[PDB]
């Protein structure tokens, strides 16, 4: 395992290479400059990025002595034995030759001496402090530490002389993931169809080991693809199959479709199966959403060419049963970016501070595996107008909404995170949330028109057998005020009558495929119990809200330049 | 115990078998394709599904070395001994042969290192993290883990290299339940009159550890039935009774009628006794309810060939004392689906966010043991129009109704859960709850007419001695405005 | 804020200790309506943690002598929810009010947002400012981003057409029609009620 | 007993349960009785004490795991069944939940006859009327 098995972290690779080799390959040059070099480094970043891999590479390549310390390994039962172990380790490393200490998972043996309440721990931290600097501290030996939680480290350890430089081995870019793919697929047999560039493009949040898993999964599929035609061969597997195995691109596509970044394992959504053809109507809204989500992620060169950031947030609002959650599901299934579906009241908690802590964790996950889409269903449940309740739970709702405001727009890194909100009562949403920069695009999802109801009906009957002679134009022409849910209800009633007729025919045939499709009579009798869901009061309320937004359109003209 | 005793999950069985067997039976394939197989598995699912059973089967079947580690078994009072125990365990596992390490109930020794506050917990978790994937690396050691809640585990442990893949051993289906029934009734001597298809059909939310319970209860019913009649004979049990013991179908019917899925044991409803003959009138309503609740269950083939999902919800409204709750009781009694009953405000709590937690727990228990009929009595208590209170009560009822909205139609798996609502004040209901897909059908339960009143009187006097010459038609004619309660 | 007992005030103490250590420092408290929330009223079995946090912040802001100069910047949206203790002279004195831009301010905003933006040479931005007569900086940012998105769409369409006809830069700046079309979906961010209440707060003080 | 297994040190409550079950299974077919089990089964989801979670998990493993039990029977007693870990209320751990509730008039007569069997009464005493008049008295 050399230095060419690590990809996507060339800068950090050089940063560690200089400190580890130059003071141990050309020490004389450091006598020429006059000062001594740094002799302590802390690697930090999300798990599965290559920290331990880089330590292994340094150990294998550099010809100096290498000492390995696992975190908990130092601790022991006998009194004052942990410090003895640390002293023995440092002395053994120092006496023989110039050496590299490696402390893996240093967070376990550095509890900050301020939140800890133990005794042995607080002396082992002090012993480490003394060993790293003091009288006769260190003579030509370098210390590398690896951690996943750099903030859980004693600040005294993060001082010059002890740990001078902090290397951040974080999430890789598309080019980094391409390099990782090339590294992990260099020792396997691939078919010519495989195209790693597109495969790296469609990967959006995978870090390091994640990519490796994908490769393994792909290979595993091939193992279960060419063993159904051949028997188990308990005695020995024939050699005609051992050769010419090959890993097709379809295997990689399949393995990619059944995996997610390791950071989003907790927020995995059930695989809902909807498509863009499943959503009837809303053609212009579908195109607008598709372009406003796909342009930042697929065409970033133009945005930096113009030097402006893209729009991020969007809020659907309209009467119930119009296609808001359906659109969110379509985005979840079709769009390539990661999806975090978060319900409205899920994040609230009885304890103190866990509402805002939960929101912060969700948004940290979103910003880690970017590009990501975050769906806030019924946004008016958690983000309500501030200061409207005289009797509250200690102002917990106001603190939740303030956490949302600061997290979606604040002192962040302006990563690609797209917030989608869906509420059917947009009047209760706090005004600050609807400012551009947080949720800038307010999309009204109205009731379908005459030409849209037909599209909805066709969308809902795309997998259903029907008679040849009927026409769904009459059903559309005769609603005139229905919503998508109401048309769905009509279809369901028709299906129920068809099933009833089929069951009755089967019973009659048993007493002594009659119904292979839905008859026209099954629609004629199914729409006699069909009523509109939304009344005129809510319709005029939403129209008034829309007109309040258009009230900013007054006193405008062609504004010809 | 072999692999032919874990019927119900064939896919998960093969998924485990891949890395448990292929890298040991035929190692040539992996060296031919170049890449190494996965060496980390995490089986998760609801309690009583076969996780420990599958680990036991793997231990009995595989020729590799096996090492069993119970969860809270490694920790000791001495400072620095838990990690020593883990080190010794893995060293013993790896020093001998290509071994398998099974860690049972692993959620108790991996509390994320961030929500926990102890000190031994952090060190144990860090030891495990470094030892499963650190410098040096494992060698022919594959680790299996089982837990009932995977979300309470360190994210650093749910990564490739440590726990490569997560297998979901979930709730079986009709075919799986039939397989489990065949497996658990293969060593007992059944009667000739018992079929297992009907038992697997009427058994709905049983997780597979309940099938064994059903079988054992039926056997115990047979034992007591044939022991209470024939003399005890404490000195010695005669053999003419053992050779003719059998287990009849009626015993299985009894055991089935006197049990419930373990997941719904907390929400078991008191055994009320109402029947379709107890509710007079409402013949069309009875038919509508019977179809709406039976067609999706008995005939899924029809729905899937027609490519449409069944309608689920239904609301009853009308004057008080007309039969809404009576219809709910009749459904709960003789319908072939699980029943969840909640009063109106019964799910409210003083704590912040706890009401939504209750409504989510109930709808999750409902979705797990599907098909399930959730009866929400007096919806107007739990679901009222949002933003109607000028003086706010802490902004809770709005959140409760929002949680209901998202739980009846949101990002879900579209399971067979039917919601029965009953109210006598429809005007105070959130209009977004009455949308189709949440509560499709709105059934008015009107006051009885003359024929309905006569049928109600006959239904109420089903079990009652009367005069031979008594005529109830005059009573029905005299009222002309009464309800069932009157 | 933290669930456990002490953690909250301990965190404020650590933050201000860090502030004092690296003096001079500028501690920016964003959205003070969450820390300095009004307490007047009754107790809703909250536990009194909000009161303890406010008292810790008040005691830890007043103990700054001339040495260790630490200037705290506050920023709140709703100025009526901030507890008056913070506003007392000697603890947090200066009150800056950030009003909505005027036409000259709006032109300045537009020029400041379009620094790194290739633009049509025959383009004047005075018109946009003259048109938006009640907008905010965020609204102008939204207008410019909409124009950029239309430009990107035109660029991608031209590139697709060029590729299709194949079997150097069609659009090198946000053109006139792009900005003309971008404002079709340009709403106003703040309504009149918020401006009214902010003016009332300003004139009261 | 319920709270008597809890211990000061980390990793000793579970050791106590291990020793108890090993002693029960060490020698002969045995009956174990956990009085007030709800005090050491806080449901593992609503509780924040890590010792509580560990002891619950240890109990689950002892009741039903690989090499679960060998001819040993366990009985529990509680007043709040709903406040028990659902993983414990499964077949193989606690399969038959017997409901020892309030008696009826006949049961109350039986209880009266049992308790008044060792004390000496008067000639003019009846227990049928006394049992019938009592309504809500349990045990």
């Amino acid at each position: 395992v050399g230095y060419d098995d690590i990809g996507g972290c060339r800068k950090q690779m050089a940063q560690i290479r200089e400190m580890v080799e130059l003071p141990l390959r050309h020490p004389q040059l450091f006598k020429a400059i006059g000062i001594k070099p740094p002799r302590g480094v802390l690697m930090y970043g999300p798990p599965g990025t290559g920290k331990t891999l880089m330590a292994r590479a340094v150990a294998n390549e550099t010809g100096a002595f290498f000492f390995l310390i696992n975190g908990p390994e130092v601790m022991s039962k006998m009194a004052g034995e942990s410090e003895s172990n640390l002293r023995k380790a440092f002395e053994e490393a120092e006496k023989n030759a110039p050496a590299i200490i490696f402390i893996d998972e240093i967070d376990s043996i550095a509890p900050k001496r301020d939140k800890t309440n133990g005794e042995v721990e607080r002396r082992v931290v002090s012993q480490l402090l003394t060993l790293m600097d003091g009288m006769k501290a260190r003579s030509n030996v370098v210390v590398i530490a690896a951690t996943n939680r750099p903030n859980s480290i004693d600040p005294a350890l993060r001082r010059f002389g002890r740990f001078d430089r902090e290397v951040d081995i974080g999430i890789p870019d598309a080019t980094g993931r391409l390099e990782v793919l090339r590294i992990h697929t260099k020792n396997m047999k691939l078919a010519d169809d495989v195209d790693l560039e597109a495969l790296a493009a469609e990967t959006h949040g995978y870090v390091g080991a994640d990519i490796a898993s994908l490769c393994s999964e792909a290979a595993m599929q091939q193992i279960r693809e060419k063993m159904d035609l051949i028997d188990l061969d308990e005695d020995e597997i024939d050699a005609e199959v051992l050769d010419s195995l090959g890993v097709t691109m379809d295997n990689f596509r399949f393995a990619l479709g059944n995996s997610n970044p390791s950071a989003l394992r907790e927020t995995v959504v059930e695989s809902v199966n909807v498509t863009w053809d499943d959503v009837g109507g809303l053609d212009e809204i579908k195109e607008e959403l598709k372009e406003t989500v796909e342009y930042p992620v697929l065409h970033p060169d133009q945005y930096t060419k113009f030097g402006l950031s893209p729009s991020k947030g969007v809020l659907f609002y309209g009467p119930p049963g119009t296609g808001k959650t359906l659109l969110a599901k379509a985005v979840a299934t079709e769009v390539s970016a990661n999806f975090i579906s978060v319900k409205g009241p899920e994040l609230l908690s009885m304890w103190y501070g866990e509402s805002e802590s939960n929101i912060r964790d969700i948004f940290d996950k979103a910003r880690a595996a970017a590009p990501t889409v975050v769906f806030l269903d019924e946004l008016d449940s958690i983000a309500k107008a501030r200061g409207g309740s005289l009797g509250d739970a200690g102002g917990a709702s106001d603190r939740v909404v303030n956490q949302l405001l600061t997290e979606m727009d604040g002192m962040n890194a302006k990563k690609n995170v797209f917030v989608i909100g869906a509420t059917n009562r947009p009047d209760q949403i706090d005004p600050a949330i609807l400012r551009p920069g947080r949720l800038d695009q307010l999309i009204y999802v109205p009731l379908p028109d005459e030409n849209a109801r037909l599209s909805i009906l066709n969308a809902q009957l795309r997998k259903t057998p029907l008679e040849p002679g009927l026409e769904l134009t009459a059903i559309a022409k005769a609603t005139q005020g229905f919503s998508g849910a109401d048309l769905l209800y009509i279809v369901q009633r028709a299906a129920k009558y068809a099933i009833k007729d089929s069951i009755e025919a089967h019973r009659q045939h048993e007493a002594e495929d009659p119904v292979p499709y839905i008859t026209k009579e099954h629609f004629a009798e199914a729409m006699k119990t069909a009523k509109r869901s939304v009344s005129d009061a809510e319709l005029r309320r939403y129209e008034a809200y829309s007109q309040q937004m258009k009230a900013s359109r007054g006193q405008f003209s062609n504004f010809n330049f | 115990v072999g692999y032919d005793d874990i019927g119900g999950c064939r896919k998960q069985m093969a998924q485990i078998r891949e890395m448990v067997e292929l890298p040991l039976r035929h190692p040539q394939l992996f060296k031919a394709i170049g890449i190494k197989p996965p060496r980390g598995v995490l089986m998760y699912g609801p309690p009583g599904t076969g996780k420990t059973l599958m680990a036991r089967a793997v231990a009995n079947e595989t020729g590799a070395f096996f090492f069993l580690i119970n969860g809270p078994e490694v920790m000791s009072k001495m400072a620095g001994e838990s990690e020593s125990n883990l080190r010794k365990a893995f060293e013993e596992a790896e020093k001998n042969a290509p071994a398998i390490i099974f860690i049972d109930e692993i959620d108790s020794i991996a509390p994320k290192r961030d929500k926990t506050n102890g000190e031994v917990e952090r060190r144990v978790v860090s030891q495990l993290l470094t030892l499963m994937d650190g410098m040096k690396a494992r060698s022919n050691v594959v680790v299996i883990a089982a837990t009932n809640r995977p979300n309470s585990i360190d994210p650093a442990l749910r990564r490739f290299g440590r726990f490569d893949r997560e297998v979901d051993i979930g709730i079986p289906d009709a075919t799986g339940r039939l397989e489990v029934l065949r497996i658990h009734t293969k060593n007992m001597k059944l009667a000739d009159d018992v079929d297992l298809e009907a038992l697997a059909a009427e058994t709905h939310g049983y997780v597979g550890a309940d099938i064994a319970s059903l079988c054992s209860e039926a056997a115990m019913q047979q034992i007591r039935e044939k022991m209470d009649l024939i003399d005890l004979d404490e000195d010695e049990i005669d053999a003419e009774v053992l050779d003719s013991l059998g287990v009849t179908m009626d015993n299985f019917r009894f055991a089935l009628g006197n049990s419930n899925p373990s997941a719904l044991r907390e929400t078991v409803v008191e055994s009320v006794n109402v029947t379709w003959d107890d509710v007079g009138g409402l013949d069309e309503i009875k038919e509508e309810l019977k179809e709406t609740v039976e067609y999706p269950v008995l005939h899924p083939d029809q729905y899937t060939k027609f490519g449409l999902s069944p309608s689920k919800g239904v609301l009853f409204y009308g004057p008080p004392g007309t039969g809404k709750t009576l219809l709910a009781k009749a459904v709960a009694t003789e319908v072939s689906a699980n029943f969840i009953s909640v009063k109106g405000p019964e799910l409210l709590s003083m704590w912040y966010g706890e009401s939504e937690s209750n409504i989510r727990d109930i709808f999750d228990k409902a979705r797990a043991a599907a098909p399930t009929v959730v009866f929400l009595d007096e919806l107007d208590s739990i679901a009222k129009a949002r933003g109607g209170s000028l003086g706010d009560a802490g902004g809770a009822s709005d959140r409760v109704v929002n949680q209901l909205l998202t739980e009846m139609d949101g990002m879900n798996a579209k399971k067979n859960v039917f919601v029965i609502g009953a109210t006598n004040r429809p005007d105070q209901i959130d209009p977004a709850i009455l949308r189709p897909g949440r509560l499709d059908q709105l059934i008015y339960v009107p006051l009885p007419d003359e024929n309905a009143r006569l049928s109600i009187l006959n239904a109420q006097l089903r079990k009652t001695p009367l005069e031979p010459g008594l005529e109830l038609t005059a009573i029905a004619k005299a009222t002309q405005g009464f309800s069932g309660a009157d | 804020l933290s669930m456990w007992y002490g953690e909250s005030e301990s965190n404020i103490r650590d933050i201000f200790d860090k502030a004092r250590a690296a003096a001079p420092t500028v501690v920016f408290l964003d959205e003070l309506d969450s820390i300095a929330k009004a307490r007047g009223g009754s107790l809703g079995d909250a536990g009194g943690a909000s009161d303890r946090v406010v008292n810790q912040l008040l005691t830890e802001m007043d103990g700054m002598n001339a040495k260790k100069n630490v200037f705290v910047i506050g920023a709140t949206n709703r100025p009526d929810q901030i507890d008056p203790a913070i506003l007392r002279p000697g603890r947090l004195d200066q009150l800056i009010y950030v009003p909505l831009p005027d036409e000259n301010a709006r032109l300045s905003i537009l020029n400041a947002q379009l620094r790194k933006t290739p633009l049509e040479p025959g383009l004047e931005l005075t018109a946009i400012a003259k048109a938006t007569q009640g907008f905010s900086g965020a609204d102008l940012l939204y207008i410019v981003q909409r124009a950029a998105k239309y430009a990107i769409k035109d660029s991608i369409e031209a590139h697709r057409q060029h590729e299709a006809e194949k079997e150097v830069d069609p659009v090198p700046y946000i053109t006139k029609e792009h900005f003309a079309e971008a404002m079709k979906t340009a709403k106003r961010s703040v309504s009149d009620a918020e401006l009214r209440r902010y003016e009332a707060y300003s004139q009261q003080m | 007993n319920g709270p008597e297994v809890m211990s000061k040190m980390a990793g000793e409550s579970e050791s106590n349960l291990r020793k108890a079950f090993e002693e029960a299974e060490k020698n002969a077919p045995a009956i174990i009785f956990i009085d007030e089990i709800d005090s050491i089964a806080p449901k593992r989801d609503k509780t924040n004490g890590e010792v509580e979670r560990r002891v619950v998990s240890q109990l689950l493993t002892l009741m039903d795991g690989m090499k679960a039990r060998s001819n040993v029977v366990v009985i529990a007693a509680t007043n709040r069944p709903n406040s028990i870990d659902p993983a414990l209320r499964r077949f193989g751990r606690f399969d038959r939940e017997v409901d020892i509730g309030i008696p009826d008039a006949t049961g109350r007569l039986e209880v009266l006859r049992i308790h008044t069997k060792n004390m000496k009464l008067a000639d003019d005493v009846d227990l049928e009327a006394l049992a019938a008049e009592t309504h809500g008295y349990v045990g």
Partner: peptide, 22 residues
């Protein structure tokens, strides 16, 4: 020779309640 020992018992949390104003 002497020996050390580890102990981690519990902590104290804070809850939040809701009220209903007439």
């Amino acid at each position: 020779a002497a020996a050390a020992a580890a102990a981690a018992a519990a902590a104290a949390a804070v809850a939040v309640a809701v009220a209903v104003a007439a």
